[model samples]
Every structure is written in structure tokens, then in C-alpha cells.
Target chain A: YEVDHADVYDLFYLGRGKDYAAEASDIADLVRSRTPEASSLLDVACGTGTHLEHFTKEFGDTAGLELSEDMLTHARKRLPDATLHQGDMRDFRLGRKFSAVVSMFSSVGYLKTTEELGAAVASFAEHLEPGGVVVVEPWWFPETFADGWVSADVVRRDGRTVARVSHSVREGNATRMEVHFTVADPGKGVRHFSDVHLITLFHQAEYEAAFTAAGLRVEYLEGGPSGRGLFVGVPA
Target chain B: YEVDHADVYDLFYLGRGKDYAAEASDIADLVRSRTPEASSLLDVACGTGTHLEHFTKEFGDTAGLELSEDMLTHARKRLPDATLHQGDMRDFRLGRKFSAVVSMFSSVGYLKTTEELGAAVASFAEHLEPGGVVVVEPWWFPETFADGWVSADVVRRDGRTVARVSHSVREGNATRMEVHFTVADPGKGVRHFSDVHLITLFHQAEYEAAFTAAGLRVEYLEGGPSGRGLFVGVPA
Candidate 1:
């Protein structure tokens, strides 16, 4: 279930569809309001094509770019018409461009460094058509997250029950969050799923400069579809 | 602007208000939404009364127990009417109980390990009044922040422009953010603020256990002004 393994994904996706699809719905509703003019759309980091369920239907030209083969299996079934590709965010170019591009939920922050954020921004700008827009939902800045952190919750669907344990540490500006999901059933079964998600914390302005440095005109709004502020970059 | 001797009281006041009055204004607001009536407040690691501004205004009775003379200077300014004492969050107490207790941000995480987060949580719980509550904003968990490391930006204010370059190094579950703010103020001065914050890789269950072990009722909610959900145990 970590990243890029179809066998693992098959096991993980069984009971997670409602959750992921709900989240994707939030994303879809968010993108729809942006009123993108392009007939086609490019979904970067399109894991399992969960988001494509609600995206490709309205847009004339819908494409997806993802690197996880395990994730792609689910994506392929969901988005048969999409032009899916295996690529990285920094240097992916098909010698073609889209009118709009999207990166979501701190996916850009997973770059491991700020200079890389700039690089990712540059790649998006490079692939955008004229009057094109790139929307990114970056992670929360470190300042928004204080020093220590913790979270606990229970997920239940009929006979299936899962308890979630979440903890966070601010190692300087980056807060590391670890989630451990313990899934159990009345029929004698238990499993644990854990992952470390490192989220980059950026002040409003720092994110803007990266967009500007990428050769794109930027527009920032407080909150967007993911319930995060959208950074819209329109290429000149 | 950094936490220091000059404004410890202000920080404490703010911390208390954050715990008692402010509750959870951010994502965990639900934790403090149903705060009960408390007789007093004990601020562990309560420096110069930094929380005084919020504490005095929110809690009917409040006291700051600190260990540094330097912190006293700032605390006195923020909580002139408060009773300030010298104590620690781990083992210091004045043979008294408070209805609400707080250990702020990284102050608790300074322990650097689970044994410490446990010790700190236990100490804060011991000081609370019967049916009292303990509000803690622990260091963020590390696993959640694994790969999203990157920093970049430049800020301009009042003729003083500062350039910040952020870099991160990930070693296992921890990430170290090295933020260097190059401050330039025309003719007056040039300086840099380098701050490194640390958080944990543990998930939410650990904190709940800590709270439960401390004999406090635990409630966690999405952060917001509405819920303030993270308040520790309170009697029904």
C-alpha cells in the first residue's frame, strides 16, 4: 500500500474506495469552479485515477500522468480514454502541451527541497499551452503547524472497524506525520497500514515566487477545491 | 520575534489562551470546543508569561511557573497581576491543582523521545483539578512529513527586505529544515534568523494513550475555532 505496487494496491483499495472517491469528489467540485477554458486536462500524480472518475466526464480531452504501476491498474480501469504516461514532474514533456495542469495535496511538496519546488513549477509552466493555467494545492507551511502534534480516530463501515493513529513532529519547518491504521473484522482478521507523509510548510509568498520563477503569471486565492488555497499560474 | 527572554510572559499568556480560551482555533479546534469550568491554570514550561495576554483575559485565575530569571523579565510585563513561580513541567509543582493545564508547542517535544512525551503529559495531568482538562499541541508527528521538504522565499517589509533559502535533510523518519533568513534593512542592519524545529514520527494513538494514562478524558476534533477538540479528560 506504500507507493507503486499493484499487488499492494489491490489489497488496499478494497475498502478505501468510498473514502478516496469522496476526497476526489471534493477535488472535482473544486476544479469545476475554476472554469478552465481548455477542452483537455492533464492530471499529474494521478494515482489510481480516483480523481479521473469525476474529471474526464466533463472535459473533452482528459489525460493522466502517473508513475506508480500499482496505482495505474486502478487508474486504467477508471480512465480508459485518458492519455496516461509514466513520468516525473521535473522533466516530463511529451512534446505536447495542455491548456491546464494540476498537482494536488502537497504532491509538489514531496520534492524533498525548496529548490525542487521551483523546478517542479518550471516543468508545469513548460507544458502549458497559451493562456494555460496550472493549479497547485501545496502543503501547509510550518508556521501554520506548531511544534508537537497528535490525532486519533475510528473508521467503521458495518462489520469492518478501523482505528487510526496519527502523530506529527515539527523537525524545524517540516512537520512529519505518521498514520497507522489498524483494521479489524469480527471474523478474526487484523492488519496494519502505516506511512510517513512529509509535508512542506510554505508562507504564502514563498510559493508565489516559485510560480513566478517558472515563467508563469500567478494568482493566489485563500482556499480552493481541496479546501486549500489554489495557486493559479497562467502562462503568457 | 523569536521565543526568548524579552517576551516570555506574552508567550505564556498566549499559550494559556491558546489552551483554555482560544481552544483549538486551527485544525484541532474540536479538541477544546466543550471546555469545562476550571478553577485555575498551570503553564508547564511557562516562560515569561507569553500566554499571559490570552490567559489573564480568558481564565479567571492563572499563574505562571517558570525556571529562568530572564523569562521573568518578559513574563512580568505580560502578566503583571499573575503569580509567577519557578517550576518545570516534568517534576515541578507548588502543592496545588489547576482546573486547566497546558504544555505548549515544542515545549513538550523537547524531550526528544516517546518516554519524554509520556513524562511531560503525565506531569501536566498531575497538576490539573478534578474534572479539569489538559490542552496540548504536541510536536507534529514525523511520518506525516517524510518527503515534503523544500523551502524558498524573499520577504520585504518597512524598507527591510529579507531573503530566505530553505533546505532540508531527511534522515530516516526525521527531517531537519534549515531556514536561513537573510535580513537586510537599508542602512540600519543585516541579520539572519535560522530556526530548526523538530517533530516525531509517531501517530495519534500514542498521544491519546499519554492523555488516557494521565487520567484525562481525550477528545480530538478537526482544528478550528468551532471545535477546539483536543482537550484532555474532563468529568461528565
Candidate 2:
């Protein structure tokens, strides 16, 4: 799907889906627990502003940064009151620090290697106050990943239907993943599409190392708010 | 994304979608208008039983043929009373005849060559009564396809969200289609995946030729129920 194709994004996400309020609630609790002075928040790769819808309620001041053009278009439409920009996660320079800078939903998983992961955390550190908390939801650890994992799911809104199926086969250290999608929009009829994603299968220690390398004191919550995994880091 | 991951697939397409009652209604009207005594149907590549759910009501008898395990699983769950089999459309021989056989949503586009298209049509002829009809929704003909077409959509249900983006580039007589999906599940978190599909780009004449070569008298509906194009063929 192209960056201008919003329907493709929405057909699989966006509307009538799960409420991010609970995840926001949990992230807020973690932020408050770590840095009670945290009064502002920034969501990195905050596609469509789903999480920020709740974050704006939790933190009176909230903003977002997303990489995809279409996703930013959608986020802008939803969060007209917030500041959202298009930028890279690994090197984004907001030039201003927030009380808390967070990246949720494993958006960091797209970094091809652990070095890039560290850079992303370093960037978070750059955009956060000296004691601001940075919470990141991480991809599964290699030790926990089953090489030949499979899954399928469906999502729909009004007359639009999407059926997606995917499989992952390990290619040495990296996971070679292929996701297939079938979309039916009563207006456009049906179209079949797919994508290839390469994500580093970094371990729990690797993530902690990345945060430490970024000059942050970090803790890995056993089952964080997202349940996949969460890394809480505070700039020392 | 893992090779055996369907959560990627399900994340993009499985919830809040649709039941193709309108398309089914239109197909039924065409079937009754042609085969007055039609009472049963066989749906090829019936990914999620939407058509058959409506088929059973209009045709009184319904069965399905599908190749994907994940999709078949969903169709089976929905159409518990109907027989569903795992098989390819080009070579599947159910050894039973139905009053009507349908392959909808342009799933037929997966046939990579013109020859395979004819074989699939012949397979449909093999499973139809002497006067039974075969209704197929077709991919855009080469004349109708834009060289660099792009689309995006999102689907949300429960606590899950899927975002999909796709691009279609022409490769000689075929279209190389790539679909990228990012899924966020409350339970599974978020992951990126994709699939590459090679779809034969046939002209309207080639489709008609295939139907005739399959020993069926075919009619191309100028405006099919889906508005893509429909082929109604009856065995000679």
C-alpha cells in the first residue's frame, strides 16, 4: 500500500477497533510511578493518534511524531489540537524536551538492527527532560520467539472487510516475515495485497543494553502494559 | 512477523469486516434469471463464508473450496452446516455438480497465465450441471489497470487494529502486487508483515476466450454486481 492510501491503513486499523485508553492508562501509571513531575508527553510513530486520544486526557499536554505520510494525515485529522510531525524515530530532533517521551506498539521493531534500536532510544533520550521517563514496547525476544510462528485475523468497518494471514520463517538471525491481506471495499470491490517486513529479533538483554548505551537507567517489566514487553528508562 | 504467523494476517483483515449479502443477492438474482431451477451453489476460494452465508439462504444448498488453512478455518467456523474443502481452484475436482458455481472477489486473478485461467474455468464447468452457471468476478483488464496504482486502508475491531498499504506495478503481462500490513493486537502487540502476489492481467477478450475454450457459452456483464466485471458461463 502507498503512503497516500489511507483506506488500506483504516481497513486494517483505525476505526471501531480496541480502545487505547487502557494501554494509555497503564503507560500513564508507569510514567507517574517513574517521574511524578512528568506533565507532558510525546508519542513516537503515533500512527492515527489512537493512543494519544487517551494520552491527551492523561497528560494535559501531548504530541505525536509519525513517519508515514498517510498515517500522519489521519493523525492530523483526529488530533487537530495536538502537534504531530513526520520524522524518523532513530534520529528525530525535536529540539525541545518533554516530561516524558514514549514509543508504544512495538514501532521500534522496524529498526533493522540493535544499533538502530539504541539510536532510537538515544533519540528518545534527546527529546526528554533529564529525568523524563521513556517507555518503549519492544518486539519479542529471540529466546521467546517460535521460529515458525503463524497467525490470522480479520477487521472490518461498515462494508469494508479485510482478511490477513502471515507466516514467519527465521532467516539466520532475522525473521523473514510475509503478511498477506485480502480487502473488500463495497465501493472498490476486493483487492489482494501483501508486504515483507524485516525485524531484528533482539533479546531482552539487548534492549536493556540499548537503553543503557543511551545513558538511561532502565527496567524491563515482566509483562508490561502492552503485554508483549515494555522497557522503562529514565535519563540519569 | 513469523512464517507461521497468522496474527499478522488476522490483524489486517479479520474483524468488523462484512457478510457479502448484497453481492450474494445480486448473484442470486442473476442465477435465478438464468437457471430457473437453481437450488445449490459451490463457492471457489471462499475465504470467509460471507458469500455462502447468503448463498445458503438463496440457493438452499451451499459448499466451498479454499486453499489456505487460515481462511478455511474461518469459513468452516461460519458455515458449520456446509461442506468446505481445501483445494486449488485450477485442479480441484469435487466430483459433484451444482446449479451454480461462483468465484468472487477476483480471487481468480491469482492464475498467473491465460492457460491457467482457462483451466480454472474448465474446473468450474466440471462442477456444474449441464445448464448450471458459473459467475466469476474478474481483476481489472490490462486496459483498465493503472500502471502504478496505490491504496491504503485500516480495520479495527475489539482491541485490535490493522493498517494495510499496497502498490501494483506491472511486470510484462502480469501485475506484481505487494501489500504491506502492520497489525496491533491487544494481546499480541504490533508487528509488520507483507505478501507479494503475481496476478495475470488478462484482457476481456482473453477471459471470453478462456470461457469458450472451456466449452461454455460466456457472457461478460458490462456492469457486474461488483462493478469490476463479471463472467457468466454455462456449460455446453
Candidate 3:
């Protein structure tokens, strides 16, 4: 619908029963397992601060970096006292390093090319302490992606109903997702809107090479939120 | 989850707000517009008799032909007085002709090959009286199909909540749909199951060829239930 992108982003995911707390706990454990003395954490490309909210509880010092001011607005409201910066993932200067720098929900896939992906990984590594871990949730691999994928959901909560439908098709080495939403409220009858997302589909080796080029020793974990897996990396 | 396929089939479509009454009225008008004397109708591949139940009210004599006995069981219970036969669409003879013959919901796509599709169309033509109409809902053409499409829905009704998710990928010339359902009930707790469907993607020319081979002049209508359109035919 004509609702705020930042607003419905959380609503749709929460309505689908995404367990941010569990994922955050798992990520924190992963970070601690790699660097036992890890304390502070920086969430790159954090949207709405849902994961950062849980991360703040897991780590004493927590901060978020988001590209969208619209998303930052919601994140700021959600975590008023937390550090949330609006910046690009490929090239951002946070000026300080954290024990762990993480990118969640495959947000790194927004990079349109391998050069951009490599730059983003380098940026993450630059913001990591010597032994800090860089945990990245990766998007689907080229071989694993279904060329014409469709998703539909109808969510009802708090006296409102929202219906979302999306179709994703392969476009060269990337996936183009066309999403439509219909929201109905008691006071505001109904409105419909659409969103298109073009996400690059990098190969597993490409991601590994990017991490390696960024001076990080990377290992791909088999399972995470969307089954595309996660890349856990540490300084080489 | 592992509920009866025939039972859940109707439940899912009805939960999606499929208007069988409205569709039946539209088809009745289409048939009468072509042949004013049309009174009897035959529904090929009628699953659970939902459409036939409404069709019987429109036409004095209505019959259904289905391939699955399980589906026929439900159809019989729903329309006990109507004539229902368990027969394959590729080859079936009811020994009598109806004024109109129709196939709904792109069920014709089950024919894996063009030859089989032609045979099914011929079978439909064999059961149609002179000057009667033959209406068939066609599946998407190869160009129109999205290879890896996905759909998900959570339906809550009658103290039970059923979540259905499906992924459709292109396999050769057909679309293979892998569907999973999670059913939760207060008394039954939760159970999960899966189903696979392979439907052919026949080209527009293939459908027209089938109708022409069956001695019927065919016209493809642009809009129908699933947006795949309908093939309306009359005796050549």
C-alpha cells in the first residue's frame, strides 16, 4: 500500500514470524565463539533496528548503519539512545572500530557489481577490530535461485489487514523483485502500491574472494534465516 | 497437513475467495450467447464439483467428469443427484452428448504433450451437441510463465489455521510446483505435508491447433480467473 517502506518492512517480516531475537542470539554466539573477548558490535545496513535492538542487549556497545533516512527514522525511534548512522555500505566512514561488524538480511546484495561487493566487504573489515568477526547473511546463489519466484501473504493484525505479493525473475546476473502491497484500515479504506528491488546474485566463490581480498578469513555457514546461509569472517 | 487432497483442494480455493457462482453465471451466459437452445452441460476435469454444483442450477442437466476417484467422492457428496463420471480427459465417452462442454481452472494443462492436449480437446468436442459451445481455460504460454514463482498464504477458519507455500520452477516444457502446507488446530496441534504438481506450458498456437484439430473454430479470450484466459470454440 501507500504505507511507509520502513513501517511495512517490519510489519511484513514480523507477521511472517521472523525470530529476530533468536537470530541475534545465534549471531552473538557466533561472534563470541570467534573472538571470545568481543564486546562492541556494529550492524551495517541495519533496517528499522529490529536486530540492533536485540544486539544492544547482547553487546554492551552497539551501533547501526543504514542507507535510508526513512529507515533510520524508524530505527532512531525504536532505539532512541542507540547510535544509528545514515551511510552507504560500499563506502562509509564510521571512524571507530567495533569488536564485531555484521550485515544482516542479505542487505549486501544491493551492491550491483563484484567491485561494489568487494568494496563493501573491505569497509566492513576496516570497521572491525583485529580479531573481530564480520557476519554477513548472503542472498541466494546463482545456482540455487529459482528464476521466476512468486510470494504472496495476507497479514491481519491490530485492526488492519495488509496483503503483499511479489514476483522475482532473473535478470542477467541479478534478480528483479516486483512487490505489490494492499493495505486496508478501518479509517483509511484501502490503498495499493508497488516496489521494485534489483539485487545482484553473486557466486559463493565471489563472496569468499571479496572477504579474502578484504584481508578476512571467511567460512560459509550452511544455515540461517533464509537458508542462503551466512558468511562468518575474521581478520586474516 | 496430511488432510484429504480433495478436501483441502476446495478449502484452499474457497479461502482464496474463488467465486464459483459468478464464474458459472459468466460461462452460462457465454454458452447461451453462442447456442440459445443450450440446456445440458458437461464439465471435464471437474474437481470436487464446486463449479458443477452451480452449473446444475444454470442448466437443467449437468454432469461432471473427473480423473481422481478421491475428488469424485467429494463431488458426489456435494451433488448427489447429478451425473458424475470418473474418467480421464484424454479419452472419455459418456455415451451421450450435452449441449455445452467446458473445462475450468486450466485443468487441461495436465496433458503433458500437445498430442495429449489435442486428444483431450477432441474428447470434449465428442460430448458436445451440434451448435453447442466448448469452453476451456488454458494455462500460461511458455513466454508468459515465470520459471521460479512462489506463493504463500495463511488461512484461519473454523478453529484451524492452514499455511500454504508453493514454489514453481520450469522443468523442460512444464512448470513443476512443489507445495507445502502446515495445518494447525487447537485439538490436533500441528502437522505438515507436501504436494507436487507438473503442468504443461502449451503455446497459444498449440491450443489453437488442438481446437482446430478437434474440428472447432477457436477464439482465445484475454481474461479469465487466473489471467491465463479462456479458449472458446464452436463447431467448424
Candidate 4:
């Protein structure tokens, strides 16, 4: 969904028990297993630069690219010394290569078409060194996704209470998720807002094709942090 | 809302931090302050017997009346020794009277009209002994309620996660709340259901009028368990 505010995004996921440190450690290990001397990394669609903060500790040199300027604003505060760019996943140029490029949190699902998916994978590959690796966390496959899924959460912190609810339904080849948020604060009173997210459900073969077309050999790794698995790619 | 299952009802409210013991204790003090010899008490719309369980400890003789068979089933299991009756709030006769009668948690809001509201208070008065007191927790007044209010919560316990979301809007003289629930369990997988609650917005004067018409001296307590306040009445 479109994150209007980064704090709410962080609060909801952190309250849901997402272990950023653990996931970042796992990703670092996976990237190093493929490229032993990988010291630089790029985090695509790095909202709030949370993963990038952990990545900077692991890789020494880390950069982040996000689509929302609102999200990038928080990322700048989070990583004052690191390079952060605001750009789309389908096409963005940083003119610098990293030893490893990772697109996480199923952000590639925002690509509406197979062509856009391939173009995004190509963009990731373009920013990779000779022995670099690309790891992309993907959304659910059609066979695995349950339509009409609903989720809700309420989190209270720092005298602020936020409640988030989402309902997802299948819309052609994408999952249209309608999310509503209610935030109550002592100073701000109560405010309600909503967002809609239409995420493309690209098939396993489509992701592989995207990688192969980008001149990389790709393999699907089952049982990732999100249970949707990950696509690991290396130079062909 | 019509509670199709009592366990879910108990789970949601308990997870939301509804302290039945504290509320019951407060109500007992309120009742006894008016009638020093109050020993027998009746709980109106006592769902799952939670409050009644605490009431039984405070009062030597305690009884409960519920509308939903599903809720009454669980209440029966909880209070095996106490008297539990399945009945409506507008009209129900126990062939008995109690020193104090309490309708709590805005259960009086379920009465759709002023006539029904008066009838329910009359019913509470009918079951009160001489010098007895009747306590009714009211719903929000029209001026107090915010239209299009939203709330959501997710609670995980004993390998089951339950998520509940509600949206309330003004529907003429009542607030119609549409609630959706998602439950995920290891053994039961995932299930989704919904409920709608149409609660009347009875004015403070109307409540006082109801009590006056029932031959009782009525007063509105500013603050109680719910911020919505309480209506306490005694024989005029």
C-alpha cells in the first residue's frame, strides 16, 4: 500500500513482530554465499531504510532507493551518511554498481505487467558488479494466495494508538488490497484514512524468465521470511 | 452485534482490555451505596457470565439474563450453580425481584425506539424490590458519537490469531456498526465472518424520562466503566 506516513508503517510491522535484524542477517549470508567478497549493497524499494540500516552494518557501504518521497524522507533521517535515491523500480539509474542488489518485501509486485517485471529485474542486474548477486523477495503465486483474505491489527505506542485493517481480493492477475487506518493520539484526536494497493501476482516461471532475460541464472529459494520465497540470481 | 460464538466475544473484549472484575466491583459498590441491605442482584444481558461471575462473589444470590442462546450456552458452562435465564431486555419476568438490577456495557442501546427503551427500563424496575436500585449503562448520545469511526485489533493466543475490524456510521437515529472478523488457527485454518450492530442513540432526557415513567428517581452518573456514563434509578 501507499505509505502516507513512515512511522505508521514501521509501527504496524514492528508490532506484528517482523524481525528486521534477523531478516537482514539472513539476506547478508545468502548474498555472501553467492559472492564471497561482497562489501557493497543496494536496497531497492527500501522504505524508511530499516533494512538498509542493518545492511550498512553488514556491508559497510549500502545505498537505498525508494519510490515514495514521503518514505524517502524518513530514510534520510535514518541514514544521514548513506546515499538514498527516490525512484521507481521499473526504471531508475544510480550510475553506480554494487556487489549485491536486493529488492525485498515483495516490492516487485508493484510492477503491473510481465514486461515491467523483466525491466525491473534488468534494472537490478544493471546495478550489479561482475560477481554480484541479486535477491528479490516476491509476492504470492496464484496457486498459493487465498482470495478474500482479511487482516487487522491495533498497536499502541508512545501515547499513540493506531489500528490498521486490510481486505484483499483477486482482481484478474493482481490482488487488490483495500486498507483502512485509524490513528488516535492525545494531541491529534482521531483521524481515519484508507489506501488501495493492486499488486501483480507474477508466476514463478515469469520471475525466472525475467531473470534469465536479464542475462542472469536464477533459482527460487523456498521458505523465506515472508513464506512467499525469494529469487536469487547470479551472472549467467 | 449478534454473537454467533461466545468464545470469540470473550476473546475480543478480553483482548481489548475489558476488566470484568474491576467493573463488577465498581457496579457492586454503586448498587450497595444506594441500598445498604442489597444482597440479591440480577445482571441483564450478561454475555458469557463474566461480570456475573464476579457479581456472584460480591452478592450471595446472583442471577443472569441473556438474549443469545450461543452466549447463554457459555454463560451456563461458567456459572453452573447460578440461575441463568434466556430472555429479552424489553420484557422478561423472572417471577422474582432483586435488591439491585444492572444492565451494563450499553446493552440498553439494543432497544430500537424510545418506546422500547421505556419498556426495558420498566422491565428493570419491575424486577427491583422496594428501596432497590437499577443501574443501566447507556450508549453514546447523538452529539457524542462520531460518524464513520473505525477500529481494528489482532490478538494471538494459544495458537489462534483473531483479527477484528469495525466501521460505524450513522443510520438515521442509530449507529450501524459493521464488523468483520478473521480467525486463523493451526487446526482450523482460516475463516472470515461479519456482524452488524444497530444501536439506538437515546437522549439523556429520554433515559431520565423512561426512569421517571417507571416510578423511579433517576440520576446520570458522569463517569463509570465506559466513558458513556451510567443511569442509576431508585424507587421514587
DockQ of each: 0.02, 0.05, 0.04, 0.13
Clashes of each: 98, 62, 6, 0
lDDT of 4 by residue, B51-92 (tens): 999999999799999998878889998888889999998899
Candidate with best TM-score: 4
lDDT of 2 by residue, B118-151 (tens): 8999899888887789999998889887766655
Give candidate 2 regions above 4 Å deviation: A1-6, A14-17, B1-236
lDDT of 1 by residue, A120-188 (tens): 889888888877778887777655665445444444455554444445666555767665554444323
User: If the candidates were sorted by their DockQ against the true structure, best first, what order would they fall in?
Assistant: 4, 2, 3, 1
lDDT of 3 by residue, A156-230 (tens): 666555666666778889888766665555334344566889988999999999999999999999878779899
Pick by lDDT: which candidate is best? Answer: 4
Residue-by-residue lDDT tens digits, candidate 4, A1-236: 12245687787788778889899999999999999999899999998988999999999998999999888888898788979998998899999999999988999999999999999999999999999999999999988887877666788766666676676788899988776666655423355566789998988999999999999999999989899999999999
Clashing pairs in 4: none
Q: Is candidate 1 or candidate 2 better by DockQ?
A: 2
* Candidate 3 stretches greater than 4 Å from native: B1-236
Poorest stretch of ten by lDDT in candidate 2 chain A: A1-10
TM-score of chain B of each: 0.70, 0.88, 0.96, 0.95
Interface RMSD for each predicted structure: 19.1, 9.0, 16.2, 7.6
Error of 1 at B172 (Å): 44
User: Highest DockQ, which number?
Assistant: 4
lDDT of 1 by residue, B119-228 (tens): 76787777777766777755445534434344334444444444444445554544455444444333333333455644454446777777777766676544423222
TM-score of chain A of 2: 0.89
Model 3 chain A: which ten-residue window has the lowest total lDDT? A183-192
